[PDB]
A paper describes a structure:
Hence, this loss of critical proteins has the potential to compromise ER proteostasis and generate cellular stress. This challenge to normal metabolism is overcome by the activity of the cytosolic coatomer protein I (COPI) polymer, whose repeating unit is the coatomer, a 560 kDa complex of seven distinct gene products (α-, β-, β′-, γ-, δ-, ε-, and ζ-COPI)25–31. Overall, the coatomer functions to retrieve the escaped “client” proteins, such as type I membrane proteins, from cis-Golgi back to ER by retrograde trafficking. In particular, the S protein – a type I membrane protein – is delivered to the ERGIC from both the ER (by anterograde trafficking) and the Golgi (by retrograde trafficking)3,10–12. Here we utilize recombinant SARS-CoV-2 S proteins and tail peptides, including constructs with enhanced mimicry of the coatomer binding motif (clientized S protein), to elucidate the atomic structure of the S-coatomer interface.
Author numbering:
A (entry chain A): 0 to 301
B (entry chain C): 301 to 307
């Protein structure tokens, strides 16, 4: 049970959206597209802030680095690129891995970026040390699909991998603090942390149609969420509301109750397959946004 | 070669 007042703030059509992110202080959303283009939209005025044809290959990963006025993007041409969103200047452009970049995460306070790749690794880059490769984390046995810092202790982070595991690592240490054998036999496409201090929870999504919730202190599976009808692209905890939001190649978003783990609402926004998700980092208007085959939508909840 | 999760 839950009162959900879902309003469509802004939707636009585009080529397939593979990455999406909210700016914390401007009413902007970044989308990164399978066509190699990236777009920054003001979702309040419904005007494009800036767009860039970055490459000819898919750009699967993109984040704002608001404290530097940057976007950082990673693509199937193996490269990390950074642009200043006020000028359009390309700040850096380097080959980060010898294979596709699937995911980029930004540390909340330090000048660190993580990239996960089909090269089986996560790499740590330091933009205050000339974008040095500070560490490579080895141990996964298939494509690393998702990386995320623990917001409550960002000296640690999680990687989710098609080898059916999540590994949680400490910066400066070469082996995982622990590996979760998820039992998601078709791999892990996504891993996320519950953001508030009261629960030490993580969440994983899989091509096996399931979402699983994990306690990272006991390393136990708390719940398995079933209901999606095709590959689950992502599942996240909302930063302010007691819900989980997932999206799937079945074309739906699902909102699940984070206490009972039962589905509360299924949304078919009409843009075909869902690939990516963002939640507004301050909880502004409880905003979420998702990217799909045929465009993106920004929704306000409750 | 074949690339999983190509889309």
């Amino acid at each position: 049970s839950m009162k959900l007042d879902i309003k469509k703030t802004f939707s636009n059509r585009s080529d397939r959206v593979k990455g999406i992110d909210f700016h914390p202080t401007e009413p902007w959303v970044l989308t990164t597209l399978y066509s190699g283009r990236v777009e920054i939209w003001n979702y309040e005025t419904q005007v494009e802030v800036r767009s860039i044809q970055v490459t000819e290959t898919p750009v699967r990963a993109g984040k704002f680095i608001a404290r530097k006025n940057w976007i950082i993007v990673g693509s199937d041409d193996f490269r990390i690129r950074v642009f200043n969103y006020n000028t359009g200047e390309k700040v850096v452009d380097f080959e980060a891995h010898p294979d596709y970049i699937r995911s980029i995460a930004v540390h909340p306070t330090k000048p660190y970026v993580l990239s996960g790749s089909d090269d089986l690794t996560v790499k740590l880059w330091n933009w205050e040390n000339n974008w040095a490769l500070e560490q490579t984390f080895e141990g996964h046995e298939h494509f690393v699909m998702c990386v995320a810092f623990n917001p409550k202790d960002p000296s640690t982070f999680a990687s989710g991998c098609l080898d059916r595991t999540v590994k949680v690592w400490s910066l400066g240490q070469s082996t995982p603090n622990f590996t979760l054998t998820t039992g998601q036999e078709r791999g892990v496409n996504y891993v996320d942390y519950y953001p508030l201090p009261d629960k030490p929870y993580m969440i994983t999504a899989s091509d096996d149609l399931t979402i699983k919730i994990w306690d990272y202190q006991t390393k136990s599976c708390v719940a398995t969420l079933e209901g999606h009808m095709s590959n689950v692209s992502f599942a996240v905890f909302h930063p302010t509301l007691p819900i989980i939001i997932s999206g799937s190649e079945d074309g739906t978003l699902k909102i699940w109750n984070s206490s009972t783990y039962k589905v509360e609402k299924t949304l078919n926004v009409g843009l075909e397959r869902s690939w990516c998700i963002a939640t507004h980092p301050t909880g502004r208007k409880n905003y979420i946004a998702s990217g799909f085959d045929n465009g993106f939508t920004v929704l306000s909840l409750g | 070669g074949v690339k999983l999760h190509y889309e």
